[PDB]
Amino acid sequence: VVGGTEAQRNSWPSQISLQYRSGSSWAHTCGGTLIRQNWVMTAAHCVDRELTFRVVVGEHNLNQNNGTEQYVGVQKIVVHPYWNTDDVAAGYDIALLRLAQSVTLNSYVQLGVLPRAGTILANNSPCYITGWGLTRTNGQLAQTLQQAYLPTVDYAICSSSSYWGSTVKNSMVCAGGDGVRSGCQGDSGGPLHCLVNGQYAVHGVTSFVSRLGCNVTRKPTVFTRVSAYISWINNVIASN
Template structure:
């Protein structure tokens, strides 16, 4: 009972101090990815795996509590050893104030099917071995209200260290890209994603110019709420096999608001 109370309090405290960067992002209406302002998305995580004695970026993630990181289920492999980097801007540089945290456990949604990403449930939570100290470079993301749906053409930003273009290079500096939300009625049309997209997903982009790409997986879709706080409405899930910036094939995200109760339940029980 005390554990559940603590978990609820943890999320309640997180909600009070979330979504407000010390270094506000430069959110000009730039089409196409661009370098983010350093540390302006302070909940962005880099999920890295170990190979030999080196660590390699594989996916993004979002810090939602001082010891919990939200990512995509397809980012997780039971055969790999992971770490989470927080407070990072340039992955190739030593940066003061950054933290490398070890996972205590990783919980993948029980309905996730690795052979069918289009089935949905592409969500996982990483519990860190220790609580991370928040700072001007490490802050918590806000989560949206349960079941809330973004309206069409809401301007959001996808952030990550994914490839700059299809089969392109991986950047050292954190990137951001402006994406406009495509409503489910449009995105599920046959000439768009059709039945591949589900109601527990969010579509954004599809203009043929800006999108998420390989390496952005698991990272946040950041949308600003009416009170000015940034909420993470999506987790980068999949895009078109035809290429990253394909017309009428918007980036598809796991819709965070559809998994509000699952997130709370996992944190309460672990």
């Protein structure tokens, strides 16, 4: 997250760290959202590589013991069948991870609320991106969970020529674009939390930013629109 602030410890308890085994240790690669005690929603492109993955729930500081973390292996990966690695701009950037064990829910570990199927937010809707991703273009991961205020940019504006043009699809949510605050590498797969009827719900799964950089004026951060995938998510869980 570029132009973020450190989140309060108990703020976003559905946020997870997706990590891969690296030598004798673990490296954060992506965010995700705990949606069941044994299911995490993330981006498909986070799990393209044939790596060993683990999920960390209740995490806040990547580099120190918080006394709140639970560590769980990834048992099964279900990527959207239409996902194409060579074509992130086609969409379908979404995957479900079945955890080897059910995690314990507490103040630091809670299920993310998902929007109703088909829901589209009005332009300039209040949302927060959260994650441990780079804090500057070509920078380094945040040690502590960051948040940034990123209001939505609706499909009509986002798909216009001076924004993303045809790269953005109706199956996506754009947020931000002010040249200051954005998602960045390492936030992928994480949530965009938007306030709807008094309740934060996860309306986005972080997907991509501009090749020009993370915080780029009129290149809002692009998220898979979670409300486009409710039936698919329900079907995967019901059948695994």
